[PDB]
Design a protein around this motif. Structure first.
Motif, PDB file in Angstrom:
ATOM      1  N   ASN A 262      75.103  79.133  70.735  1.00 30.04           N
ATOM      2  CA  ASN A 262      74.529  78.025  69.931  1.00 30.04           C
ATOM      3  C   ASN A 262      74.510  78.409  68.445  1.00 30.04           C
ATOM      4  N   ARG A 263      74.133  79.655  68.117  1.00 28.27           N
ATOM      5  CA  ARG A 263      74.017  80.054  66.681  1.00 28.27           C
ATOM      6  C   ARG A 263      74.242  81.553  66.449  1.00 28.27           C
ATOM      7  N   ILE A 264      74.671  81.870  65.234  1.00 27.62           N
ATOM      8  CA  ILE A 264      74.664  83.249  64.697  1.00 27.62           C
ATOM      9  C   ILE A 264      73.977  83.166  63.343  1.00 27.62           C
TER      10      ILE A 264
ATOM     11  N   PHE B 227      70.829  85.471  50.963  1.00 23.44           N
ATOM     12  CA  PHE B 227      72.076  84.883  51.506  1.00 23.44           C
ATOM     13  C   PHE B 227      71.910  84.789  53.013  1.00 23.44           C
ATOM     14  N   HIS B 228      71.812  83.551  53.480  1.00 22.63           N
ATOM     15  CA  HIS B 228      71.777  83.131  54.896  1.00 22.63           C
ATOM     16  C   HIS B 228      73.139  82.531  55.236  1.00 22.63           C
ATOM     17  N   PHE B 229      73.805  83.151  56.199  1.00 22.03           N
ATOM     18  CA  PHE B 229      75.129  82.771  56.725  1.00 22.03           C
ATOM     19  C   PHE B 229      74.921  82.419  58.195  1.00 22.03           C
ATOM     20  N   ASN B 230      75.070  81.142  58.513  1.00 19.74           N
ATOM     21  CA  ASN B 230      74.542  80.573  59.791  1.00 19.74           C
ATOM     22  C   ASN B 230      75.587  79.691  60.472  1.00 19.74           C
ATOM     23  N   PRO B 231      76.553  80.284  61.223  1.00 24.18           N
ATOM     24  CA  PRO B 231      77.380  79.509  62.168  1.00 24.18           C
ATOM     25  C   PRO B 231      76.545  78.778  63.227  1.00 24.18           C
ATOM     26  N   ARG B 232      76.698  77.460  63.253  1.00 28.41           N
ATOM     27  CA  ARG B 232      76.057  76.507  64.194  1.00 28.41           C
ATOM     28  C   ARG B 232      77.167  75.957  65.091  1.00 28.41           C
ATOM     29  N   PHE B 233      77.135  76.259  66.388  1.00 28.21           N
ATOM     30  CA  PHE B 233      78.226  75.851  67.311  1.00 28.21           C
ATOM     31  C   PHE B 233      78.090  74.381  67.725  1.00 28.21           C
ATOM     32  N   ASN B 234      76.956  73.733  67.496  1.00 27.13           N
ATOM     33  CA  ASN B 234      76.770  72.308  67.890  1.00 27.13           C
ATOM     34  C   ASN B 234      75.718  71.683  66.988  1.00 27.13           C
ATOM     35  N   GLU B 235      76.166  71.148  65.858  1.00 28.80           N
ATOM     36  CA  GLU B 235      75.364  70.238  65.025  1.00 28.80           C
ATOM     37  C   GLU B 235      76.020  68.870  65.148  1.00 28.80           C
ATOM     38  N   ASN B 236      75.372  67.995  65.925  1.00 32.80           N
ATOM     39  CA  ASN B 236      75.866  66.637  66.271  1.00 32.80           C
ATOM     40  C   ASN B 236      77.332  66.753  66.723  1.00 32.80           C
TER      41      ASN B 236
ATOM     42  N   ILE C 220      79.360  76.022  59.450  1.00 33.44           N
ATOM     43  CA  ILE C 220      78.669  77.237  58.948  1.00 33.44           C
ATOM     44  C   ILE C 220      77.793  76.751  57.808  1.00 33.44           C
ATOM     45  N   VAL C 221      76.503  77.010  57.928  1.00 36.24           N
ATOM     46  CA  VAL C 221      75.501  76.673  56.892  1.00 36.24           C
ATOM     47  C   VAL C 221      75.157  77.921  56.092  1.00 36.24           C
ATOM     48  N   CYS C 222      75.281  77.861  54.761  1.00 40.23           N
ATOM     49  CA  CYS C 222      74.829  78.960  53.867  1.00 40.23           C
ATOM     50  C   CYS C 222      73.685  78.479  52.984  1.00 40.23           C
ATOM     51  N   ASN C 223      72.695  79.331  52.755  1.00 34.87           N
ATOM     52  CA  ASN C 223      71.527  78.908  51.945  1.00 34.87           C
ATOM     53  C   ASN C 223      70.746  80.136  51.500  1.00 34.87           C
ATOM     54  N   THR C 224      69.735  79.908  50.678  1.00 30.45           N
ATOM     55  CA  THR C 224      68.802  80.914  50.121  1.00 30.45           C
ATOM     56  C   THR C 224      67.385  80.416  50.396  1.00 30.45           C
TER      57      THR C 224
ATOM     58  N   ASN D 281      60.736  78.510  51.089  1.00 29.06           N
ATOM     59  CA  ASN D 281      61.401  77.201  50.917  1.00 29.06           C
ATOM     60  C   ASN D 281      62.917  77.403  51.003  1.00 29.06           C
ATOM     61  N   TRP D 282      63.583  76.771  51.976  1.00 25.80           N
ATOM     62  CA  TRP D 282      65.066  76.693  51.933  1.00 25.80           C
ATOM     63  C   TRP D 282      65.550  75.819  50.758  1.00 25.80           C
ATOM     64  N   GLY D 283      66.656  76.216  50.168  1.00 27.99           N
ATOM     65  CA  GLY D 283      67.238  75.521  49.019  1.00 27.99           C
ATOM     66  C   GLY D 283      68.300  74.539  49.451  1.00 27.99           C
ATOM     67  N   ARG D 284      69.233  74.255  48.551  1.00 27.74           N
ATOM     68  CA  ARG D 284      70.402  73.358  48.752  1.00 27.74           C
ATOM     69  C   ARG D 284      71.441  74.064  49.634  1.00 27.74           C
ATOM     70  N   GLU D 285      71.741  73.529  50.823  1.00 27.99           N
ATOM     71  CA  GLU D 285      72.751  74.111  51.731  1.00 27.99           C
ATOM     72  C   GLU D 285      74.135  74.025  51.092  1.00 27.99           C
ATOM     73  N   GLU D 286      74.978  75.011  51.391  1.00 28.66           N
ATOM     74  CA  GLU D 286      76.429  74.968  51.162  1.00 28.66           C
ATOM     75  C   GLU D 286      77.117  74.989  52.515  1.00 28.66           C
TER      76      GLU D 286
HETATM   77  C1  LIG Z   1      66.646  72.736  57.796  1.00 29.47           C
HETATM   78  O1  LIG Z   1      66.982  73.601  58.863  1.00 29.47           O
HETATM   79  C2  LIG Z   1      66.969  74.951  58.473  1.00 29.47           C
HETATM   80  O2  LIG Z   1      68.140  75.247  57.727  1.00 29.47           O
HETATM   81  C3  LIG Z   1      68.115  76.589  57.214  1.00 29.47           C
HETATM   82  C4  LIG Z   1      69.326  76.679  56.338  1.00 29.47           C
HETATM   83  O3  LIG Z   1      69.277  75.678  55.294  1.00 29.47           O
HETATM   84  C5  LIG Z   1      68.037  77.611  58.360  1.00 29.47           C
HETATM   85  O4  LIG Z   1      69.290  77.684  59.060  1.00 29.47           O
HETATM   86  C6  LIG Z   1      66.835  77.285  59.269  1.00 29.47           C
HETATM   87  O5  LIG Z   1      66.715  78.108  60.443  1.00 29.47           O
HETATM   88  C7  LIG Z   1      66.115  79.300  60.316  1.00 29.47           C
HETATM   89  O6  LIG Z   1      65.761  79.744  59.277  1.00 29.47           O
HETATM   90  C8  LIG Z   1      65.923  79.978  61.623  1.00 29.47           C
HETATM   91  C9  LIG Z   1      66.313  79.362  62.804  1.00 29.47           C
HETATM   92  C10 LIG Z   1      66.153  80.010  64.019  1.00 29.47           C
HETATM   93  C11 LIG Z   1      65.609  81.275  64.093  1.00 29.47           C
HETATM   94  C12 LIG Z   1      65.524  82.000  65.409  1.00 29.47           C
HETATM   95  C13 LIG Z   1      65.186  81.874  62.915  1.00 29.47           C
HETATM   96  C14 LIG Z   1      65.344  81.242  61.693  1.00 29.47           C
HETATM   97  C15 LIG Z   1      66.817  75.825  59.702  1.00 29.47           C
HETATM   98  O7  LIG Z   1      67.848  75.558  60.684  1.00 29.47           O
HETATM   99  C16 LIG Z   1      67.442  75.130  61.899  1.00 29.47           C
HETATM  100  O8  LIG Z   1      66.353  75.315  62.362  1.00 29.47           O
HETATM  101  C17 LIG Z   1      68.499  74.444  62.673  1.00 29.47           C
HETATM  102  C18 LIG Z   1      69.190  73.367  62.125  1.00 29.47           C
HETATM  103  C19 LIG Z   1      70.106  72.651  62.880  1.00 29.47           C
HETATM  104  C20 LIG Z   1      70.357  72.994  64.201  1.00 29.47           C
HETATM  105  C21 LIG Z   1      71.430  72.306  64.969  1.00 29.47           C
HETATM  106  F1  LIG Z   1      71.400  71.001  64.811  1.00 29.47           F
HETATM  107  F2  LIG Z   1      72.676  72.720  64.611  1.00 29.47           F
HETATM  108  F3  LIG Z   1      71.290  72.486  66.232  1.00 29.47           F
HETATM  109  C22 LIG Z   1      69.650  74.044  64.778  1.00 29.47           C
HETATM  110  C23 LIG Z   1      68.754  74.752  64.006  1.00 29.47           C
HETATM  111  N1  LIG Z   1      68.178  75.961  64.616  1.00 29.47           N
HETATM  112  O9  LIG Z   1      67.617  76.775  63.901  1.00 29.47           O
HETATM  113  O10 LIG Z   1      68.211  76.068  65.822  1.00 29.47           O
END
Ligand SMILES: CO[C@@H]1O[C@H](CO)[C@H](O)[C@H](OC(=O)c2ccc(C)cc2)[C@@H]1OC(=O)c1ccc(C(F)(F)F)cc1[N+](=O)[O-]
Ligand SMILES: [Cl-]
Ligand SMILES: [Cl-]
Length: 138
Positions: A31-33, A45-54, A59-63, A68-73
């Motif tokens: 589901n995620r890395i 630097f948050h590097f977040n491969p999402r295997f199922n977003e809709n 891949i979501v990158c952010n700070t 507070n999460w910022g503007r996603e790339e």
């Molecule tokens: C607004 O959503 C947020 O975006 C941030 C980046 O801009 C982080 O990725 C952040 O997640 C974390 O920081 C985080 C998440 C999990 C853990 C264990 C620790 C930290 C969170 O994402 C989701 O929650 C998310 C957004 C979308 C989806 C998706 F739709 F893709 F399923 C799933 C998630 N999911 O975190 O599971």
């Protein structure tokens, strides 16, 4: 395998010409890395491969600053596959993190956090078997 979540200390933080290498295998039905380069509680630097977003792979990158999460790339190229071994290389350059996966350039992310020598931990988490995580100065 290393235990995930895994913290890799980055002694004295990051600096240009520092190469971070992460070797692992994606679990089945992943589901995620996440890679989280941390400055204390902040995420430089948050590097977040999402295997199922809709039903898309993105891949979501952010700070994260003061919780507070910022503007996603967002990147549409998604080189990861459930069940398959990967290599992620993050090379610190002067203006950005440069990320290659399986020896192919993927993306860069401009430095929002400026105190590079205070980004002293890398968190590696999510649906992977982690083989190794290391760094070298090139
Ligand atoms: C607004 O959503 C947020 O975006 C941030 C980046 O801009 C982080 O990725 C952040 O997640 C974390 O920081 C985080 C998440 C999990 C853990 C264990 C620790 C930290 C969170 O994402 C989701 O929650 C998310 C957004 C979308 C989806 C998706 F739709 F893709 F399923 C799933 C998630 N999911 O975190 O599971
Ligand atoms: Cl371990
Ligand atoms: Cl800063």
């Amino acid at each position: 395998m290393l235990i995930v979540p895994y913290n890799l200390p980055l002694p004295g933080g990051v600096v240009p010409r520092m190469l971070i290498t992460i070797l692992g295998t994606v679990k089945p039905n992943a589901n995620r890395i996440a890679l989280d380069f941390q400055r204390g509680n902040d995420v430089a630097f948050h590097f977040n491969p999402r295997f199922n977003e809709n039903n898309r792979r993105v891949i979501v990158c952010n700070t994260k600053l003061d919780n507070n999460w910022g503007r996603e790339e967002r990147q549409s190229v998604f080189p990861f596959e459930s069940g398959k071994p990967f290599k992620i290389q993050v090379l610190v350059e002067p203006d950005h993190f440069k990320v290659a996966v399986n020896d192919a350039h993927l993306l860069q992310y401009n430095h929002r956090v400026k105190k590079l020598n205070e980004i002293s931990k890398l968190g590696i988490s999510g649906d992977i078997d982690l083989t190794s995580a290391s760094y070298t100065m090139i």
